[PDB]
Design an enzyme around this catalytic site. Structure first.
Site, short mmCIF file in Angstrom:
data_model
loop_
_atom_site.label_atom_id
_atom_site.label_comp_id
_atom_site.label_asym_id
_atom_site.label_seq_id
_atom_site.Cartn_x
_atom_site.Cartn_y
_atom_site.Cartn_z
N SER B 58 53.38 23.38 30.30
CA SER B 58 52.59 24.15 31.25
C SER B 58 52.07 23.40 32.45
CB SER B 58 51.42 24.86 30.57
OG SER B 58 51.92 26.01 29.96
N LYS B 61 53.77 24.52 35.59
CA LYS B 61 53.39 25.78 36.27
C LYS B 61 52.70 25.49 37.59
CE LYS B 61 53.00 28.21 31.89
NZ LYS B 61 52.18 28.78 30.83
N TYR B 168 62.49 28.54 34.21
CA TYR B 168 61.18 28.38 33.63
C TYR B 168 61.19 27.39 32.48
CZ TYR B 168 56.94 29.34 31.06
OH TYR B 168 55.75 29.20 30.37
N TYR B 220 43.73 27.27 29.58
CA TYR B 220 43.84 28.52 28.81
C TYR B 220 42.48 29.16 28.54
CZ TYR B 220 48.74 27.21 27.57
OH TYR B 220 50.07 26.79 27.56
N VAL B 238 51.14 22.29 26.24
CA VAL B 238 51.16 22.38 24.79
C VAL B 238 51.75 21.14 24.10
CG1 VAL B 238 53.45 23.47 24.51
CG2 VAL B 238 51.53 24.11 23.00
C1 LIG Z 1 51.67 25.83 28.68
C2 LIG Z 1 52.49 25.36 27.78
O1 LIG Z 1 52.40 24.19 27.51
C3 LIG Z 1 53.47 26.30 27.12
C4 LIG Z 1 54.82 26.34 27.83
C5 LIG Z 1 55.86 26.87 26.85
N1 LIG Z 1 57.18 26.26 27.05
C6 LIG Z 1 55.98 28.38 26.91
O2 LIG Z 1 55.59 29.08 25.94
O3 LIG Z 1 56.49 28.92 27.91
#
Ligand SMILES: *CC(=O)CC[C@H](N)C(=O)O
Ligand SMILES: *CC(=O)CC[C@H](N)C(=O)O
Lengths: 292, 290
Positions: B58, B61, B168, B220, B238
């Site tokens: 994440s 992002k 993604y 989060y 995560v």
């Molecule tokens: C925010 C995070 O770390 C989760 C990213 C993970 N690949 C997802 O569920 O898209």
């Protein structure tokens, strides 16, 4: 020269009050003049600058939420408070549901005594006891269906620590405490200085409580426009549906920090002063107030 | 003495890892803990597992979102994605997938090339894709495919579903160490100005937009708790990473970028030991922006 700027910006933004209008669901609030716009900024050496309708009284409404939150933290301590109210955007204290919970834990065995503590904390900050707009209070009390619904809801779920009518009395009266842009700019200056009253020269709110207050403002102070304000203004700010905005900048112009009190009764669809919001955004951008 | 302090604090917080859990390839050491702090004059301090590679997850992002603003501009991105905690927030999966889908490029390969070119401007190199992680996400990504089709259904994806999901899950599997995230943090701290390259690599208004999102939605469902007890923009992944930053304001007078790594994750999805360390530093060094 901030004073001249503020005069020009108030001139410029005042007309946009046509794009929204005053609050309607509290009728004694639907009666106010809608083209009004005013601002005060207070510096810690006591210099203040005002422009527009800076000295018209209005009710604090949701602004009072940060006071009662602070008052509840000073009384019961932070752990007690955060077990009953959430700090995430159990309900948030900037939201009616969380604010009702906060009203019900203010120390005292009646509404009167819960409110004497609130009032006495407020005197500490602004230097006088505040006037309660009974007319506004009366009309909210007749018509407070949604709040009584929430309050019964919170009571069912064990989140209240007072009786419903009692809690609603305290909550509707705090909302009807009256203010000028001046009084809210002073509460904002004090928060900017971590609970330190820069005029009285003493510590009036504990620093950690004042930090929790600032974070909730940046995070949940502008209803459903909080992320927007954080992104394009960058100043912790708290609105009230009567058109007040309390904002603040921690220690360009205003190097030592400042408190800001704004009033612009025409509100937008999010519940924030339309012209007051515009003005705050201008200042933030022009003078680079954003704290990140 | 920040360095010796960081050493003692990693040592102290390390064991608490026992309260957490690693996130499928992601589940294969729990007790690792690293930190890197970087200042504009180039000095970096580090401690623990500061040079161990991990996937950004994440944290990407934030880069994605920045990259989408740079090509399409702020107005366009904010029509498709919300800034608050219908559009979805770019810090959550739904808004992140919308963002991936509006990156420029006729294909998933192009979109990703655009993202790597921005990544390389920040960190000075092309990032490595942990294809193990990528592939074991590719197979088990039902939840993400649900969301992506949902977004297609409601006209909030501007590319095709499998194409968006590839971009993604690929940004997610980009690699770094605490170091690369510390550098991105610094640049953000300095409003998009790269203090070691000495150039404006992110527009100022995009960087502020970024930091606001971090402060507001970067952790989060603990973002409010971070803002109130740490008070520093921060973004978790995560896989145990946290990117954090302090804007120029006793130590770190000029600001800093912070990279943390602690793979034991808490109930909220944030590094358990990483969050504790960051809180201790913020508290001990008075880093809070409020
Ligand atoms: C925010 C995070 O770390 C989760 C990213 C993970 N690949 C997802 O569920 O898209
Ligand atoms: C939130 C606000 O500005 C006024 C609160 C008002 N009394 C209410 O609707 O609860």
């Amino acid at each position: 020269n901030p004073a001249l700027q503020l005069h020009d910006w108030v001139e410029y933004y005042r007309p946009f009050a046509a794009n929204g209008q005053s609050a309607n669901y509290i009728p004694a609030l639907g009666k106010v003049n809608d083209s009004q716009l005013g601002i005060c900024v207070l510096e810690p050496d006591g210099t203040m600058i005002h422009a527009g309708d800076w000295n018209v009284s209005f009710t604090m409404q949701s602004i009072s939420k940060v006071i009662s939150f602070i008052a509840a933290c000073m009384s019961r301590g932070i752990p007690y408070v955060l077990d009953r109210v959430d700090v995430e955007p159990p309900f948030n204290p900037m939201i009616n549901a969380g604010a009702l919970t906060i009203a019900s834990i203010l120390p005292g065995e009646s509404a009167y005594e819960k409110l004497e503590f609130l009032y006495s904390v407020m005197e500490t900050l602004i230097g006088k006891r505040p006037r309660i707009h009974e007319e506004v209070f009366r009309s909210e009390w007749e018509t407070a269906h949604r709040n009584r619904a929430l309050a019964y809801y919170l009571k069912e779920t064990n989140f209240l620590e007072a009786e419903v009518e009692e809690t609603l009395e305290v909550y509707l009266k705090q909302c009807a405490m009256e203010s000028t842009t001046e009084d809210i700019a002073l509460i904002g200056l004090i928060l900017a200085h971590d609970g330190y009253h820069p005029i009285r020269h003493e510590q009036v709110i504990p620093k950690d409580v004042a930090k929790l207050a600032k974070a909730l403002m940046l995070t949940c102070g502008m209803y459903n426009a909080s992320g927007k304000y954080a992104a394009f203004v960058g100043v912790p700010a708290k609105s009230g549906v009567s058109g007040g905005i309390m904002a603040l900048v921690p220690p360009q112009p205003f190097q030592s920090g400042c408190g800001i009190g704004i009033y612009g009764p025409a509100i937008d669809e999010y519940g924030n002063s339309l012209t007051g919001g515009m003005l705050l955004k201008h200042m933030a951008q022009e003078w680079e107030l954003s704290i990140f």
